Design a protein around this nucleic acid. Sequence first.
RNA 1: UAAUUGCGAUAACGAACGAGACCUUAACCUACUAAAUAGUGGUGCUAGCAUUUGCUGGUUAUCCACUUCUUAGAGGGACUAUCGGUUUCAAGCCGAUGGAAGUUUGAGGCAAUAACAGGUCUGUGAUGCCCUUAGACGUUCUGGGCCGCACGCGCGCUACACUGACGGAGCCAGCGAGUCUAACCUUGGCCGAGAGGUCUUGGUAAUCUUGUGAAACUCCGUCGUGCUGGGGAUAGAGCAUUGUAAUUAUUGCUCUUCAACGAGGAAUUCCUAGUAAGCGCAAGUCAUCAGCUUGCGUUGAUUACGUCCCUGCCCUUUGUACACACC
RNA 2: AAUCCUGGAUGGAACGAC
Lengths: 206, 145, 141, 82, 100, 63, 143, 67
Amino acid sequence: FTPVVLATPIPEEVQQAQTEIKLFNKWSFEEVEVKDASLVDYVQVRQPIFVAHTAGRYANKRFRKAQCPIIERLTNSLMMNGRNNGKKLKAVRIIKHTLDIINVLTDQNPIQVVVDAITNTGPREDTTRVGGGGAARRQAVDVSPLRRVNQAIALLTIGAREAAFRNIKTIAETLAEELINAAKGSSTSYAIKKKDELERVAKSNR
Amino acid sequence: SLVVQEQGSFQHILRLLNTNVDGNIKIVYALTTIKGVGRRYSNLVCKKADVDLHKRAGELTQEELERIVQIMQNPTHYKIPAWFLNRQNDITDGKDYHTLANNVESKLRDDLERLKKIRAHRGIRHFWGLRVRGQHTKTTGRRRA
Amino acid sequence: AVPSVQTFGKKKSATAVAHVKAGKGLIKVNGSPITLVEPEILRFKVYEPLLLVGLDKFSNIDIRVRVTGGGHVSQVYAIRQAIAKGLVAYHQKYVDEQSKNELKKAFTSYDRTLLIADSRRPEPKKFGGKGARSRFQKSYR
Amino acid sequence: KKKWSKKSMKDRAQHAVILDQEKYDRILKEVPTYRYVSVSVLVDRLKIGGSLARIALRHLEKEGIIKPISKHSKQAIYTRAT
Amino acid sequence: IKIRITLTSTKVKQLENVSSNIVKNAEQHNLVKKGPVRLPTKVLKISTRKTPNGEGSKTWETYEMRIHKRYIDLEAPVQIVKRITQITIEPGVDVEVVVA
Amino acid sequence: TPVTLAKVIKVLGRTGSRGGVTQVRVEFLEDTSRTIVRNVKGPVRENDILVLMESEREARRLR
Amino acid sequence: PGVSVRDVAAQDFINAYASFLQRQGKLEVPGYVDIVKTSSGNEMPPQDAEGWFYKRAASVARHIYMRKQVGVGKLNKLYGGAKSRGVRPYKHIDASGSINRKVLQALEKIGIVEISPKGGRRISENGQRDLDRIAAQTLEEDE
Amino acid sequence: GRVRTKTVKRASKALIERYYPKLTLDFQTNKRLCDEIATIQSKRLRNKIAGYTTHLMKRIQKGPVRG
RNA sequence: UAAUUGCGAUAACGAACGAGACCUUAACCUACUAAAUAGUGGUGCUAGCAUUUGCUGGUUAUCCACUUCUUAGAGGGACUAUCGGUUUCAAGCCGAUGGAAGUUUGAGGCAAUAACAGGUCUGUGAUGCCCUUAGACGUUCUGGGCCGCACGCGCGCUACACUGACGGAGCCAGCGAGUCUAACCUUGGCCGAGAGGUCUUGGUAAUCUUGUGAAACUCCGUCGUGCUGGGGAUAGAGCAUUGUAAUUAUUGCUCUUCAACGAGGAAUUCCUAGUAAGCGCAAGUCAUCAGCUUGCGUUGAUUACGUCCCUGCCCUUUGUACACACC
RNA sequence: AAUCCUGGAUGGAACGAC
């Protein structure tokens, strides 16, 4: 490393995050090896980003979104329920505070934490209607990894949102504790509960 | 960052103008509990009485309280611009007052009664309980009572 | 005279023109350095080319940007695209081609839009609805 | 007027707006060991009000008991200094 | 002498033919000028319900009128100015010359 | 509570009255050479991987 | 190296400048301060209320240093904002004009601002140097 | 889809059956001689004709084509 | 195949309409033409700080030079180009590369035959027939009414809150409209809390209004889960404007009043990318009045990329006691 | 030079014509 000078002043930490390595906002992307396979090739890591904001267009084709960073997908899902439509900047700020919190608690990489939570809360089976017309039933089937991912993300976001609704605990910390409970496996997470529900129902309707 | 521990001289709900005012909330939004008193008037009077608005109502002195009362019930002597008032150029004497907890409703009743005995259109409308500001009555104010 | 160029980055409707020349490494935005944009995170988003290529390449050169149109985010994106374009054109004209092409390669490897503009344009508004595709609502009974 | 819902009541917590010496020194002894600290922490723990929590976070940060890591308004974040 | 000529027409090829014959006349007379400044053409929209009556699907129709405006700066003697006022006149084209 | 991983090798077609479902034939990673047919819910491609909560079953093929 | 107002963050600069003027304590106060909303589109007066005239003066001074000329119309257009007309949708409204007018009058009084040609008001050279020094102090505070 | 109309295909067939000792499998030059040798009112149509002619010559280079 | 779009098959051959083609618009062009009613750079004068070169600015008659950004005009450019697969191996289709653009590039305009006893005589000095035609259903003047409310339906606007409200600062668009025998859009200056008033100014307009400094947005603070500083109806009082005239308040402003509403049951609508949704802006009607529409732009997602189960549509085959045709 | 092989479907209720 060398601290360079320009006509306009650049801080040293940004110089380091420039030349020494490419971080997150302020975190690493390496040593975040996904644990469970079959989610690999569908979560986008090893292609770092400094912010989850990007004018990327993965909605033109079918399977493109797999190459979108999972954090951008999180920020994307966070802006919903009407008034929060758009306002991606706020979602990013919330992510940042959340990662700060998940680094002070459970001091491992918060990125590693959330990906382990995703891998944990992936609904492996799910029911669906099949029938010869009026003779139709809720047959249980296997879930795609992409659908596992999307369902997991939606569950996490909705759990945090419904927790932070009408009460003081912020959307950020709600999301944080939800991700933590999911990463561990706790049955207190909205996501984990829904997942166990679905898998039980799949078992029953085999 | 400043933290005064406390003293037990604090008080919960108090009384003034025949009104059970709630303490433990900031003075302005506390006072607005009173009928005939809004956020503007309250903030203004608490400014004029030289009060710290960061303070809570239940932790105060009766002197501050009564000075505020005096300013409330006699505004003009403390340099009020006379158009904040809820009742100015009143109806009879042309003097400008600021009606309060019970006087608000009493005067409202007096005005409605005046118009009714006058057999005015607005008075008849109020007497029947309908809408008066020229609104439509076809699709709204159905379960009005 | 000076080895100097002028380029531009674009967005929905935000345009970021940028004069570039040889200098001492001052990087200004309509009156002011890069560090005073105040989305406070899109700041890092616009640092990105510098964070990719290292700041050493910016010592001998100065940039001056004028921006207009669109919202703050679109302005930022036009800014960074104009920046990368000016750097590339400079390395093309005055510097050899190897630096220019490896620079372009690194940029496109991190992200494509840093050099090329996204051709996504606002679709118009049609009658029978508030926006383009949305209609108002159907009432049967 | 049919409501088409259930609409049960709540517990109606009664958090404090002012403190006392007991609350204050309880805070001073218990805020450490809270690896993460914020307003919602200091209200789902100790039943102080939100303004109290704001002022108290500022106070502790002043002398230095809690370490700040980010001071965004609407989301203040601290840990314990060790 | 410092004249402006202004063409505020619709038929763009007529406007262009007029501008072209005028500028070749000016340059064969060897007169300094500014080239034909094409102001940004302007559109007049009119959005109306197609139907006279009120029923039918809620359809709308935007009738447009494009207008193309050009103008030229010349320094030229009074006699050439006068004959030019006389000549290079196309129907459907609105033209106006001003001095100073 | 074990599972079985399998790799996709061949997509067959869509199925279900509403067509929100897909038939596939997979190849087990461990204990390879075993090819079973299954139903799937969401989007899928070849060479993807799936997690049979039970490996000993298969749906009525439609062909 | 020399500096400007364009070389410092706006919020911190304005804070420092309004603090400097409130410490100087000479500029002006109309008398009907702490009584109005600054805007018919606002619903409550300012929260601080022990000041904020210095703040608005700082903001407009920075604005003038950025621009060439300004007017009460422009300042109302700027500081005005979204009004909540009860139920009918929000809408832009121009802020209070008399306030900014008295601000500019007091600024010409203290000699930081002048009247411009082409109408409106203009930065002074005295104000230029003073704001330059204040901004110097501003980005000196972090040393 | 990207299918071409009988006008295109008929014209391409005419050009191929009576200008074979000519144009090659380059779209650009085939265009630049098409607009020269025939009358077309739209650049779009000319490009389509050029492309289909080129594809038919690709076909011709490996055996004949019916019609 | 989006498609009677084509490859082909062939008692059919050659044609035509429609589709497509076409036109407009939006994206590419540092290639042409140029442009103080658009910019850019430099040079002069000038402010400040640094001073050591510099940075930030201002400067209409300081000129000089250029056209990348801006405007246009003429043209080019994508035709699925190249490659690899798959297909009787043809039409074509899938993936990848390049590319500004590879869902007929995107959205629109135009849009057949035949028909509806759809709607409109309240747009028509378009209209036949019938009624009326001077106490007229003509015409015109006053005042009312079209808004009248025990109730039921539909288009929407507000919110039911911290992904928040409020107060400060921060501070960015584009579409377009605008005075003549009128009196329009108004800058700037003064007054006023505010609305607004007033003295002036520019503009028949890429020039002036107007960078239309819009709002949402960001940073700071207060608030603190309390039908609460959420919400802001219903009312009272007063001050203003338009209009001859506002009284069943035209509308705007101030204060006060502060009600339901705690995410909405049966049912149901729209929607596949800069799109939904949010956010406001302009024009329309207009003396005044947007909560409506038509356009504009700012922020900007998720989830499919499939199916015919329901609702319907096209072709073929079949059956039919149907023909104002499963009502 | 090794080499054994195959085709396959169930299904509820749904009046009438002013």
